[PDB]
Enzyme design. Sequence first.
Site, PDB file in Angstrom:
ATOM      1  N   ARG A   1     -29.620  29.406  24.452  1.00  0.00           N
ATOM      2  CA  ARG A   1     -29.099  28.467  25.424  1.00  0.00           C
ATOM      3  C   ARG A   1     -30.146  27.463  25.920  1.00  0.00           C
ATOM      4  O   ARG A   1     -29.873  26.284  25.979  1.00  0.00           O
ATOM      5  CB  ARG A   1     -28.460  29.218  26.595  1.00  0.00           C
ATOM      6  CG  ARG A   1     -27.105  29.815  26.277  1.00  0.00           C
ATOM      7  CD  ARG A   1     -26.264  29.937  27.542  1.00  0.00           C
ATOM      8  NE  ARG A   1     -24.908  29.459  27.267  1.00  0.00           N
ATOM      9  CZ  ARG A   1     -24.474  28.203  27.432  1.00  0.00           C
ATOM     10  NH1 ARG A   1     -25.265  27.247  27.911  1.00  0.00           N
ATOM     11  NH2 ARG A   1     -23.214  27.904  27.120  1.00  0.00           N
TER      12      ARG A   1
ATOM     13  N   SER B   1     -38.826  29.957  36.243  1.00  0.00           N
ATOM     14  CA  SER B   1     -37.463  30.397  35.917  1.00  0.00           C
ATOM     15  C   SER B   1     -36.390  29.463  36.510  1.00  0.00           C
ATOM     16  O   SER B   1     -36.699  28.660  37.314  1.00  0.00           O
ATOM     17  CB  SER B   1     -37.224  31.855  36.302  1.00  0.00           C
ATOM     18  OG  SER B   1     -36.717  32.017  37.593  1.00  0.00           O
ATOM     19  N   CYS B   2     -35.145  29.554  36.060  1.00  0.00           N
ATOM     20  CA  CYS B   2     -34.140  28.597  36.501  1.00  0.00           C
ATOM     21  C   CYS B   2     -33.885  28.579  37.988  1.00  0.00           C
ATOM     22  O   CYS B   2     -33.824  27.542  38.597  1.00  0.00           O
ATOM     23  CB  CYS B   2     -32.773  28.884  35.858  1.00  0.00           C
ATOM     24  SG  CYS B   2     -32.694  29.377  34.159  1.00  0.00           S
ATOM     25  N   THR B   3     -33.759  29.747  38.568  1.00  0.00           N
ATOM     26  CA  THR B   3     -33.373  29.879  39.945  1.00  0.00           C
ATOM     27  C   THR B   3     -34.568  29.615  40.832  1.00  0.00           C
ATOM     28  O   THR B   3     -34.447  29.036  41.916  1.00  0.00           O
ATOM     29  CB  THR B   3     -32.815  31.283  40.166  1.00  0.00           C
ATOM     30  OG1 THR B   3     -31.769  31.517  39.205  1.00  0.00           O
ATOM     31  CG2 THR B   3     -32.249  31.425  41.535  1.00  0.00           C
TER      32      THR B   3
ATOM     33  N   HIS C   1     -24.445  33.540  41.717  1.00  0.00           N
ATOM     34  CA  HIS C   1     -24.434  33.207  40.290  1.00  0.00           C
ATOM     35  C   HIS C   1     -23.018  33.081  39.729  1.00  0.00           C
ATOM     36  O   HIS C   1     -22.079  33.810  40.114  1.00  0.00           O
ATOM     37  CB  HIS C   1     -25.156  34.283  39.456  1.00  0.00           C
ATOM     38  CG  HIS C   1     -26.649  34.308  39.605  1.00  0.00           C
ATOM     39  ND1 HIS C   1     -27.473  33.368  39.031  1.00  0.00           N
ATOM     40  CD2 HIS C   1     -27.468  35.201  40.215  1.00  0.00           C
ATOM     41  CE1 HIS C   1     -28.735  33.655  39.308  1.00  0.00           C
ATOM     42  NE2 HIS C   1     -28.760  34.772  40.014  1.00  0.00           N
TER      43      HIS C   1
ATOM     44  N   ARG D   1     -22.439  46.756  35.387  1.00  0.00           N
ATOM     45  CA  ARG D   1     -22.358  45.867  34.211  1.00  0.00           C
ATOM     46  C   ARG D   1     -21.154  46.121  33.295  1.00  0.00           C
ATOM     47  O   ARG D   1     -20.765  45.246  32.518  1.00  0.00           O
ATOM     48  CB  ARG D   1     -23.677  45.852  33.425  1.00  0.00           C
ATOM     49  CG  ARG D   1     -24.824  45.126  34.166  1.00  0.00           C
ATOM     50  CD  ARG D   1     -26.007  44.819  33.244  1.00  0.00           C
ATOM     51  NE  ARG D   1     -25.557  44.175  32.005  1.00  0.00           N
ATOM     52  CZ  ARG D   1     -26.304  43.999  30.919  1.00  0.00           C
ATOM     53  NH1 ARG D   1     -27.567  44.414  30.889  1.00  0.00           N
ATOM     54  NH2 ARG D   1     -25.776  43.403  29.856  1.00  0.00           N
TER      55      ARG D   1
ATOM     56  N   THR E   1     -31.905  40.688  41.090  1.00  0.00           N
ATOM     57  CA  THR E   1     -32.473  39.365  41.109  1.00  0.00           C
ATOM     58  C   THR E   1     -33.974  39.485  41.264  1.00  0.00           C
ATOM     59  O   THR E   1     -34.451  40.333  42.003  1.00  0.00           O
ATOM     60  CB  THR E   1     -31.887  38.504  42.280  1.00  0.00           C
ATOM     61  OG1 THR E   1     -32.564  37.249  42.315  1.00  0.00           O
ATOM     62  CG2 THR E   1     -32.055  39.179  43.626  1.00  0.00           C
ATOM     63  N   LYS E   2     -34.707  38.631  40.560  1.00  0.00           N
ATOM     64  CA  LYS E   2     -36.151  38.550  40.723  1.00  0.00           C
ATOM     65  C   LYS E   2     -36.504  37.241  41.445  1.00  0.00           C
ATOM     66  O   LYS E   2     -37.618  36.703  41.294  1.00  0.00           O
ATOM     67  CB  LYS E   2     -36.851  38.579  39.352  1.00  0.00           C
ATOM     68  CG  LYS E   2     -36.349  39.632  38.366  1.00  0.00           C
ATOM     69  CD  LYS E   2     -37.360  39.849  37.229  1.00  0.00           C
ATOM     70  CE  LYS E   2     -37.385  38.689  36.220  1.00  0.00           C
ATOM     71  NZ  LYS E   2     -36.718  39.018  34.914  1.00  0.00           N
TER      72      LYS E   2
ATOM     73  N   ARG F   1     -22.571  37.785  41.482  1.00  0.00           N
ATOM     74  CA  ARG F   1     -21.981  36.987  40.444  1.00  0.00           C
ATOM     75  C   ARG F   1     -20.506  36.885  40.773  1.00  0.00           C
ATOM     76  O   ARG F   1     -19.876  37.882  41.153  1.00  0.00           O
ATOM     77  CB  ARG F   1     -22.158  37.640  39.060  1.00  0.00           C
ATOM     78  CG  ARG F   1     -23.513  37.367  38.442  1.00  0.00           C
ATOM     79  CD  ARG F   1     -23.726  38.075  37.085  1.00  0.00           C
ATOM     80  NE  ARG F   1     -22.658  37.821  36.122  1.00  0.00           N
ATOM     81  CZ  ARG F   1     -22.575  38.414  34.934  1.00  0.00           C
ATOM     82  NH1 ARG F   1     -23.511  39.290  34.566  1.00  0.00           N
ATOM     83  NH2 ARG F   1     -21.563  38.125  34.109  1.00  0.00           N
TER      84      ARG F   1
ATOM     85  N   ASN G   1     -28.421  25.366  37.127  1.00  0.00           N
ATOM     86  CA  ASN G   1     -29.674  26.052  36.853  1.00  0.00           C
ATOM     87  C   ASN G   1     -30.234  25.777  35.458  1.00  0.00           C
ATOM     88  O   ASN G   1     -31.436  25.517  35.301  1.00  0.00           O
ATOM     89  CB  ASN G   1     -29.559  27.562  37.114  1.00  0.00           C
ATOM     90  CG  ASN G   1     -28.296  28.166  36.536  1.00  0.00           C
ATOM     91  OD1 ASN G   1     -28.361  29.023  35.640  1.00  0.00           O
ATOM     92  ND2 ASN G   1     -27.112  27.724  37.045  1.00  0.00           N
TER      93      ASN G   1
END
Lengths: 328, 330, 324, 328
Positions: D11, D153-155, D181, D191, D204-205, D227, D309
């Site tokens: 991606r 990272s994105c976030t 998210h 999950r 989350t990190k 999410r 993001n």
Amino acid sequence: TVRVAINGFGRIGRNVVRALYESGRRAEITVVAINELADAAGMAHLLKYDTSHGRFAWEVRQERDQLFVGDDAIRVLHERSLQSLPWRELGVDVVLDCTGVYGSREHGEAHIAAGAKKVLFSHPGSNDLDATVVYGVNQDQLRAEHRIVSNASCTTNCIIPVIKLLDDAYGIESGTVTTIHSAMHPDLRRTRAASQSIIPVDTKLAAGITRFFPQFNDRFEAIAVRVPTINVTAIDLSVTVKKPVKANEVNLLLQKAAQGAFHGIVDYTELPLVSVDFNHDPHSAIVDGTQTRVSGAHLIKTLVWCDNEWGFANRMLDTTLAMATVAF
Amino acid sequence: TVRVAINGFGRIGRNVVRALYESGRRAEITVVAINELADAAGMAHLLKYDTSHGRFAWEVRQERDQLFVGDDAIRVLHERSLQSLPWRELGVDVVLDCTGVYGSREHGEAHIAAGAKKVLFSHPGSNDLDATVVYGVNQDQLRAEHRIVSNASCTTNCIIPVIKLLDDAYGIESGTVTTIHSAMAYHPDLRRTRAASQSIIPVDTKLAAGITRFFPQFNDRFEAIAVRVPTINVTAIDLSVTVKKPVKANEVNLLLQKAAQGAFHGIVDYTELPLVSVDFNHDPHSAIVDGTQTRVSGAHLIKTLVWCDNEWGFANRMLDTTLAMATVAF
Amino acid sequence: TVRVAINGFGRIGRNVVRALYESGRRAEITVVAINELADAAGMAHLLKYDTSHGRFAWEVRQERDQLFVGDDAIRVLHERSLQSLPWRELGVDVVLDCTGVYGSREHGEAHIAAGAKKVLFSHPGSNDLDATVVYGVNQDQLRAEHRIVSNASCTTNCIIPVIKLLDDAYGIESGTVTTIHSAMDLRRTRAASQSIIPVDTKLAAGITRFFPQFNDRFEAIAVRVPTINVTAIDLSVTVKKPVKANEVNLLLQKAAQGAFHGIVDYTELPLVSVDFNHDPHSAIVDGTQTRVSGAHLIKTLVWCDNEWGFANRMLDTTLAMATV
Amino acid sequence: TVRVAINGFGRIGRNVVRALYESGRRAEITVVAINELADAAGMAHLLKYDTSHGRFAWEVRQERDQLFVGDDAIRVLHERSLQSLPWRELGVDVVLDCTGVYGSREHGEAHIAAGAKKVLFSHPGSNDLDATVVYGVNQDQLRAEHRIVSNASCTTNCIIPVIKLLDDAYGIESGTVTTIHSAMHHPDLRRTRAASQSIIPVDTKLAAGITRFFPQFNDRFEAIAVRVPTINVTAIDLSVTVKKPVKANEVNLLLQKAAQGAFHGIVDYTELPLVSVDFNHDPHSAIVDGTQTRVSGAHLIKTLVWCDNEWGFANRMLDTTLAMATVA
């Protein structure tokens, strides 16, 4: 009681368990063992909490290699090798094998080598077994000697009874079906966000139909799409029939069958309902009479609802009883 | 320049405008005026944002009694009586009526009386208009004296071209269709109050009567149902027809594939790629046949699954029809 | 038996009826009448079929201006004015006005005048009523002469108890909240896009009205997301006393075991919002999400089936009002 | 022109390429090569079609070992071994490593030894890289001696610029963040559970990322995340306590000005009544939603922050890339 073991504890496996208890069938059937190559902790948790069905009403308890549902104790096994399962020691009358991947004689015979009296597969398997049952249609064809049996598939059980009813009444000459599935590789479609799209998917519906109705080889096709809704399926069936017919007559036929010989198996409705209204409905199929149409007088369309998972799990139990209680 | 006015600035009115700029049709056609009931701060904001393919790429603003797309000035109007729309003063060649409400000969005449030479309706309207056009199928049936025209409907446009193709090659005897619509307290239709996010919801559909208007021969031979599912902006149409001639799925796909290369280029597309619905979001074709989904049961029962961005293809067809009406014109 | 009539048969009024039967409270409350502007077939229909709560267990029939639940008959009215409601004839002890539109002292007075003994409003309503009850927190402020009562709001109900718990233990100095709403007017004209949608919220005003010492110390925002009807409330408070996250969880866990049992629940299990669908607690604190930044900024995530929890509290407050 | 290679065409790598062509940066950066294990035909199909970002406006062809974007030919590789990447041959100035696997000083060294002058990783990485760059905030901390760099990272890229802005004006004491998210991505029992109905807590990190970047907020920052089933735009709900006394309109004015000036093109500000799809494909790292700003008392700030993001992040990778090849 019929002593049953569950091979594989994915969605169908867990549903067979909930349906056993919720339906009162537990007075005639007990589940003595589950084999699953995953930890008992997660099994117990997933059994208790379901997105599609909510919170399971029985106390669920896990300890060592035991799963508890209310008072019943249930052994948990993690065996890669079917012949090393403790079926004989546990007095297994029927193994319900819910693992997915095709069913067959070799596998049934391995459950039997471990000491299970019979085997019922959740997946149609190969044309090699002692019988394939669509409960409500052909369970009286079972004999004491049929030991390795298939219950067809989630989607086949939804539509077959309807097809039977239409063909008996009018003679089907040709059929085409579209299945609209709820949410649940060499295919560039898997790696796409399901949230927003209508996604075409592979379907084996046609094969299922023509295997059950060999007079329709080269006369049935099917397609399927996945949509982001909650666990109810819509099957859109289009058949050409021999006898001329009008929609209100197709509907009367299906209403009365639901009233009569197919009560509990096929339901009928004319009420203004949406798919969620059939969530957790134990019928194989609910004919939506408001959507029945006839083009000309020979092209029938019906829209049939089912909770494919909950309907099927209940039928799995019905077939298990028919298998376990037959006279030679 | 073809002088057009838009009456009604709802989803369709706004999409017609966007299509005009995105497609390059603005080389041929100028929007002289927009008539909309309801505030115009809204108009600009919704033109800009409610688009679905990213924020509209032209600069948009609302000053005075005017809407600005790029460097174009469009006169914004608020008029309830059709009779007093100033079409004459603006020299309007076609009025594009996008209200979803006006549809009769008399509404047509009322627009023409206020000084429009011609009127195009964004929906089927009444059964006695001068013509109903499915662009790419029958624009050639537009005579010069046809001043009041219907453009059929969003869904109708998706499917009639595939029906034409199939009928001509094999001869349709009977047909049945299911439309799977994407998403758009108490109400007398009990299904409408229900959480859309969760369900397949059966909906009333006019598609069969639309097929029937267009194809007189198919009276009593065509039916339709529809459902609404919680996806966004792309419809699938599931068409099952009995045909006279014996066919296989592969031949039906060749036909449709060749037609998309040839006489229906830009109107009907064809594909065999593993695509999902969002892949046709903002696609301007009227229909996209999904080759992978084609089936023929026996040798006489064809199933075809057709995609469309119903609003976007429709908006583009509105412009196409405009030009043809203008083309040979009264 | 408390004789209750219901004004407005919207989702709230309907869950009040469903909850009445499901919790067994049929033993102390009887619903004698419903006033709803819409027709009784629609009412019976919606009562039976529900996207969030599945098929209602009891048999639902509709027959003229009567509504039948199990063996019970309920008169159905269609009055658009409060003055003509037959509350005297029917001997109403409590009107449960669920309309979301009658909330003033004079609306309560018109219910009473028509023969109702007391009135419980399903929303904050007027700022000058006899009492606003958040059951589990302040039903003991209730008195016999309180005739026109408000039950607070579903979202207020979810979070106020948790705020009280935290203020008692550690002393709240300032607070800020984000509500994440499910399928529950600048942005409505949009097309379907499957978006996070900011919406106006009244939570800050409900919190400071219940805790006036928090005036100018509390703010709240909200978004709508396309989920099932379980709300998440993300509550961030500054507190006087230093704390760690495990201390916060113990206090609320114990609160759930004890004085808030049946009102606030607590879980450390890996759950998701649907796991609280149809849960009758006002709030379920999710311990796995508790956080303390430094030793003074507490974040807690609180779940609620806002409709279901609220309809049961309405029943509690009702009983508390009638048999005082 | 800066010559660059992309390692990993998932991606992020595909978005970098899209971002390159759409931003006009194709005048300063040339993508000479893409290394990816999967088939070229698959790369092309996925580059062309994407559920978030839609149909790529540029023609996409694939023949053999070549990927054609417009009329630029790009060389495709399928090499598992960093030592064997033909960077020297191709004169690679910067490797954009977007695998999300490689991330260490050694991996960096391998690319450089194969002949890439410098390296930029598309994620946190490990705690010893030359620099970590959130572009717009610390690209000044870049030195020509910086050879192995991470882009964060994105976030982390969405929220750091905002924290900088608020810390610089007001002195942040403590912070807490919730991330909402959309459908993107110890055994996590959640999950299994279907994305299409629920709000689902996820690990989350984010706080880790903020701490790492501002070690003065060690022990002063936490984060949770959920999410929801929305499409590709994230909401970040940031709540900080500050030293200075502030009011909401002052906060908004700070942030609006930063968006006009020093953070122009990196942080945007809006007062319009919008929804999350309005920021789909928006190249900023952050868009502050001024309608949502709150301050409780004079010291507890909440701001709601939007970002695409993936798209902001793709665009930043290029910004950093460009700042890494020009230190002259």
